[PDB]
């Protein structure tokens, strides 16, 4: 009969028992109440597998040969034209992109494997659009260029700035435009450790470390600017990145 395959993103796939005279494999997966079938020349779960939607949409789901990801995309009626993309890879994270009239992509939200995420929306032929990043707690909002995910944040007189490059490397900019010397923020961006360094009045005031678990938290100096005290506390809420930056 068929063995019952477990697929990244939350599918299955049915697989033949034995293989046909062509020694391929027949695939069956029902994906949200839609019967998908196909064929392989893997025995483990791995091929193509089509369908057709009511509305007549083409529906394909590609099952990578090591079964490390599945990508279910949904095309137009004359399956020339893609609509909708979802792949989920085999770190677990997920990309659910879409696509204008022509096939470009117009919408890609990328889901990580902890549940936080980059969305990005209203992208245009340049690559650029408007940026979301979702926290545990909290939203970061801004742009999208081909260059880089801008997120800003802004308190007073300043603004902080989260950058994330093309390449996923991260950077974080201060700026401030209080004039008193006294009372203004500046601050060192550590790429080692992603840390920002915030300083007022030649002296440094805390550390805002940007993890590797997405996360972001905050810990002050002693009141000589030198040395840390106490331990970092971890961000739950805008408001205390905000009270961060006062």
């Not at 260029?145 to 944040?153: G, H, P, Q, Y």
């Amino acid at each position: 009969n068929s063995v019952s395959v477990d697929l990244p993103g939350s599918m299955k796939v049915l697989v033949s028992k034995s293989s046909n005279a062509d020694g391929k494999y027949d695939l069956i997966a029902t994906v949200d109440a839609l019967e998908l079938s196909g064929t392989s020349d893997k025995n483990n779960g791995s091929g193509v597998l089509e369908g057709v939607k009511a509305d007549a949409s083409k529906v394909k789901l590609t099952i990578s040969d090591d079964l490390g990801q599945t990508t279910l995309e949904v095309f137009k009626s004359d399956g020339s034209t893609l609509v909708s993309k979802k792949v989920t890879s085999k770190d677990k994270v997920l990309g659910d992109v879409k696509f204008n009239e022509k096939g470009e992509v117009s919408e890609k939200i990328i889901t990580r494997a902890d549940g936080t995420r980059l969305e990005y929306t209203g992208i245009k032929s340049d690559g650029s659009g408007k940026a979301k990043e979702v926290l545990k707690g909290y939203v970061l909002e801004g742009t999208l260029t081909a260059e880089k995910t801008t997120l800003v944040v802004k308190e007073g007189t300043v603004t902080l700035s989260k950058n994330i490059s093309k390449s996923g490397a991260v950077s974080v900019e201060l700026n401030d435009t209080d004039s008193s010397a006294a009372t203004k923020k500046t601050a060192a961006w550590n790429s080692g450790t992603s840390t920002l360094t915030i300083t007022v009045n030649s002296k440094k005031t805390k550390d805002l470390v940007f993890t590797s678990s997405n996360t972001i938290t905050v810990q002050q100096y002693d009141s000589n600017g030198t040395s840390l005290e106490g331990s970092a506390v971890e961000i739950t809420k805008l408001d205390e990145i905000k009270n961060a930056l006062k």
